[PDB]
């Protein structure tokens, strides 16, 4: 409702992320695609093929209808399945595998993380990119040490402490207005993710806070910036957009 500028910012930042790593007629695999909110962006990027996967049958069926009644000049494939937990094989190699605000679920257990990493490596084409957006642990924990753990929009609560240091917590409860609620999420063990990928041939090629990314593409794109309801956000809204960060791995 009021969390609009944030939805617009996160959508803007996502659109710019897609625009930086995709080319024409590209093959895109959207992990945890939800109700297909990135379609419109991919259409602009002028991609030739879109395959959306998401564990929730309801999310897919809702995603099917969007492409079913939207203006797109590319093929759409949807299949409901756990892309992070259970083994997945679509029998294809995409140019771009995207994972927006979900990869963190692939950190339920150290085993789940391994499966989700091999599923990506397997389907990614040599030289293809895997872009993603996830909450920043470093950020989240540094705000905890202070006191900024919430505001008028969001609210993050850390887990208990049974003989464990603040560096032992592996999950947190997230709350957002007009959406997420007491939704527990696992922290993204960055080093662990980077190490796991390295072994599979994927190297980290990018990492930057949502705000440093936001105010960077905003100046490079004086056009796109306006075409989409953007601008600058109040400190309260900038507090939420700061939790996240862009991370990109490339297949070599």
Please check if 127 is assigned to a binding site: no
Residue 212's Cβ-count burial label (10 Å; 0-12, 13-18, 19+) is exposed
The residue among 200, 24, 210 whose CA lies nearest residue 123 is 200
Please check if 14 is assigned to a binding site: yes
Calpha distance 180→222 (Å, rounded): 32
Calpha distance 166→10 (Å, rounded): 28
Calpha distance 83→32 (Å, rounded): 7
Sign of CA dihedral 90, 96, 102, 106: positive
The residue among 23, 39, 27 whose CA lies nearest residue 92 is 27
Q: Chain centroid to CA 51: how far?
A: 16
Calpha distance 12→41 (Å, rounded): 9
> What are the start-end ranges of the H helices in 46-82?
57-68
* Beta strands 94-100; 27-31: pairing state: parallel
CATH architecture of the domain 1-252 equals 3-Layer(aba) Sandwich (3.40)
DSSP for 100-141 reads: ES-GGGGGSSHHHHHHHHHHHHHHEEEEEEEEEEEE-HHHHH
Maximum distance among all Cα pairs of the chain, rounded to whole angstroms: 56
Q: Decide if 51 contacts 92 (C-beta within 8 A).
A: yes
> What are the start-end ranges of the H helices in 200-234?
210-220, 224-227
> Radius of gyration of the chain from Cα atoms?
18
Q: For residue 243, is it left (φ>0), alpha (ψ between -120 and 50) or beta?
A: alpha
Which residues are 41's β-sheet partners?
Answer: none
Q: For residue 9, is it left (φ>0), alpha (ψ between -120 and 50) or beta?
A: alpha
3-class DSSP state for residue 50? strand
Calpha distance 249→2 (Å, rounded): 34
Calpha distance 202→182 (Å, rounded): 33
The residue among 195, 177, 21 whose CA lies nearest residue 99 is 21
Please check if 32 is assigned to a binding site: yes
Method: X-ray
Side-chain half-sphere exposure of 30, counting CA atoms within 13 A: 29
Please check if 82 is assigned to a binding site: yes
Contacts 24+ apart (CB under 8 A), 233-239: 233/5, 233/6, 233/9, 234/5, 236/151, 236/152, 236/153, 237/3, 237/5, 237/6, 237/9, 237/153, 238/211, 239/148, 239/151, 239/153, 239/154
Tokens standing for 25? 């007629």
- Resolution in Å equals 2.7
Which residues are 175's β-sheet partners?
Answer: 155
């Amino acid at each position: 409702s009021k969390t609009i500028n944030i939805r617009n910012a996160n959508n803007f930042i996502k659109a710019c992320l897609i625009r930086l790593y995709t080319k024409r007629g590209d093959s895109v695999l959207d992990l945890g695609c939800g109700k297909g909110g990135d379609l419109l962006k991919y259409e602009r990027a002028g991609i030739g093929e879109y395959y959306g996967v998401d564990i929730a049958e309801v999310s897919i069926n809702d995603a099917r209808v969007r492409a079913r009644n939207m203006k797109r000049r590319f093929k759409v494939f949807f299949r409901a399945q756990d892309s992070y937990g259970r083994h997945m094989d679509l029998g294809k190699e995409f140019d771009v595998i995207s994972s927006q605000f979900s990869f963190h679920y692939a950190f339920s257990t150290s085993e789940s993380l391994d499966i989700a990493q091999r599923n990506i490596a397997r389907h990614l084409r040599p030289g293809g990119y895997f872009i993603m957006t996830v909450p920043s642990r470093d950020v989240i924990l540094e705000r905890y040490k202070q006191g900024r753990m919430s505001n008028d929009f969001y609210k993050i609560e850390l887990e208990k402490m049974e003989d464990v240091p603040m560096e032992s917590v592996r999950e947190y409860r997230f709350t957002l207005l007009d959406s997420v609620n007491n939704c527990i999420e696992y922290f993204v063990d960055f080093t662990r993710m980077v190490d796991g990928f390295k072994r599979l041939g994927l190297s980290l090629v990018e990492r930057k806070g949502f705000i440093d990314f936001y105010e960077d593409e905003g100046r490079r794109n004086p056009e796109l910036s306006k075409k989409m309801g953007l601008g600058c956000l109040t400190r309260e809204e900038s507090e939420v957009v700061g939790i996240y960060e862009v991370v990109v791995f490339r297949k070599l």
